[PDB]
């Protein structure tokens, strides 16, 4: 369920 990296607000 991690598809990439989170950058900035969710």
């Amino acid at each position: 369920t991690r598809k990439s990296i989170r950058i900035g607000p969710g």
């Epitope: 369920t1 991690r2 598809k3 990296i5 989170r6 950058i7 969710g10």
Partner: antibody, heavy 113, light 113 residues
Framework: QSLEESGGDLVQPGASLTLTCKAS?????????MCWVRQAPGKGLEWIGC????????AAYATWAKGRFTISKTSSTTVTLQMTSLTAADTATYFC??????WGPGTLVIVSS | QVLTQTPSSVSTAVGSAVTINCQSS????????LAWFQQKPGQPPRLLIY???KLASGVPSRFKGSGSGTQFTFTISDVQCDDAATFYC?????????????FGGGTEVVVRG
């Protein structure tokens, strides 16, 4: 709402070392991507890896780092980074970041004989 | 995943506009997982732009990015001395087809006053 890294030092080649990232004003019970990034003196940003917190728990890494370093949530306000088989190529300042939005000031690592 | 940033450096006057470019070997995640940072010496990087063109909060509008897929640009309008720093782009990728992220190589910006 801040971060601080500790645990940097001078280590011999082939040694091992654990860095800790401490959270203030909030806890890792919520949903974040907690990642480490290192920067050798005078060089560019390099991504090491991430650990998700809250409602999912994926560990992911750069190809170079994969298998040699580990990242984990050791409490609700500590995320660690563990390194092994250290060499000169690993000398750098190490940042931990929350969502690449909030950053710590950095802890430093020299590998040399 | 390799993010190519050009130029490696540029000198530019106060009052000018300045453009930095980022080019990716594969499409970034969802065609827009792409971001821009400023870093002065001894500080950690700072988020300016994410999702290719959203201003992070508290960040002035004279910073502007655009682009899609593999090609992205960053423009600073009305340059001032406070802008002198090194800038990076950050690429976020499909974790299943390769690595999750790659930092661009950095542009050093020098302001002429």
């Amino acid at each position: 709402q801040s971060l601080e890294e500790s645990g940097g030092d001078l280590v011999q080649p082939g040694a091992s070392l654990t860095l800790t990232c401490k959270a203030s004003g909030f806890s890792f019970g919520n949903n974040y991507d907690m990642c480490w990034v290192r920067q050798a003196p005078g060089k560019g940003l390099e991504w090491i890896g991430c650990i998700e917190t809250g409602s999912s728990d994926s560990a992911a890494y750069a190809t170079w780092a994969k298998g040699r370093f580990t990242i984990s949530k050791t409490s609700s306000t500590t995320v660690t980074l563990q390194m092994t088989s250290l060499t000169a190529a690993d000398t750098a300042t190490y940042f931990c970041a929350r969502n690449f939005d909030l950053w710590g000031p950095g802890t430093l690592v020299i590998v040399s004989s | 995943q390799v993010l190519t940033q050009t130029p490696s450096s540029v000198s530019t006057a106060v009052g000018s506009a300045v453009t930095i470019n980022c080019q990716s070997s594969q499409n970034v995640y969802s065609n827009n997982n792409l971001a821009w940072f400023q870093q002065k010496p001894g500080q950690p990087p700072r988020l300016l732009i994410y999702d290719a063109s959203k201003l992070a909060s508290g960040v002035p509008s004279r910073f502007k990015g655009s682009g899609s897929g593999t090609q992205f640009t960053f423009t600073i309008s009305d340059v001032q001395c406070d802008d002198a720093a090194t800038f990076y782009c950050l690429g976020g990728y499909d974790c299943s087809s390769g690595d999750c992220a790659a930092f661009g190589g950095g542009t050093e910006v020098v302001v002429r006053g």
